[PDB]
Structure formats: structure tokens, C-alpha cells
Amino acid sequence: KVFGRCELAAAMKRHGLDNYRGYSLGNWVCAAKFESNFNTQATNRETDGSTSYGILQINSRWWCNDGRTPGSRNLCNIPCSALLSSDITASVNCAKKIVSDGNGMNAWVAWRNRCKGTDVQAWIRGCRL
């Protein structure tokens, strides 16, 4: 599923991400835009041979199991393929664990490089929320 910007904002808000660990909704929408282009089916191999999955590009090195990332963990207790669903529940729940892990949203490289410090509120402008 390719989410609309506001559609995703509304879903993320419903799931409790707005100001979760102090991160306003626009941060999460911005992260999803640059991680997956709002596409739940997005998969990308990373430099370390791990793979990132879904709307928020949850990564197989620590967070989900894909059966092909050596030495990895599965801290969200989920197959990575289950993070490609049109239903964002599993990704959101895993994201809540990640963002509570100590380094906040810096865990998402694309957030650090493209969203952090920017006018992220622009990402929810126009949305009925």
C-alpha cells in the first residue's frame, strides 16, 4: 500500500506516535517519507548486508527476523515480512521500542540526515488530524 501523506499522519496519530518520546507527528511522517516514500512494501538492502522493511524501514540487524542477516537479533519478535502489511500496527509497535532504546529517532539514519532540525511540521500541514 502506498499511503497518502495525511492518511499516514492520521494512522500514526491513532497509534499513539504523536509526541511519543517527545517526537511530534511531523517527525514520524518525515521519517516515513524518506525511508519508504510512504510505501508499506518497501525493502532495501543496507551497507552491512542487513535489510530494512516497510513504511519505517525497520532493520533486520536488531529488530526483526528475515533469516538472512548473520549475527542479528529479532528484538521486536516479528518476521520482517510482517512489516510490509497495509496495516501499520506491527511497524508502529516496533518503532516505539526502537525510539525508546536510548538514541531516540537517530536510529533512523534518514531521519537524522533529512528530518532532524528541519521544519517537520510541514509534513502534517493540510491534514485533518
Q: How far is the CB of 79 from Cl ion (least distance, A)?
A: 3
Using the rule CB under 5 A, give the single segment among 23-31, 41-49, 88-96, 108-116 that binds Cl ion: 23-31
Contact status: 116 vs Cl ion (CB under 5 A) = no
Contact status: 65 vs Cl ion (CB under 5 A) = yes
The C-alpha atoms of residue 18 and residue 85 are separated, in whole angstroms, by 21
**Residue from 2, 6, 24, 75 that binds Cl ion (CB under 5 A)?**
24
Q: How far is the CB of 36 from Cl ion (least distance, A)?
A: 12
Question: According to CB under 5 A, which residues from 33 to 62 bind Cl ion?
Answer: none
The C-alpha atoms of residue 26 and residue 45 are separated, in whole angstroms, by 26
Of the candidates 83, 98, 82, 87, the one whose C-alpha atom is nearest the C-alpha of residue 3 is 87
The C-alpha atoms of residue 120 and residue 31 are separated, in whole angstroms, by 9
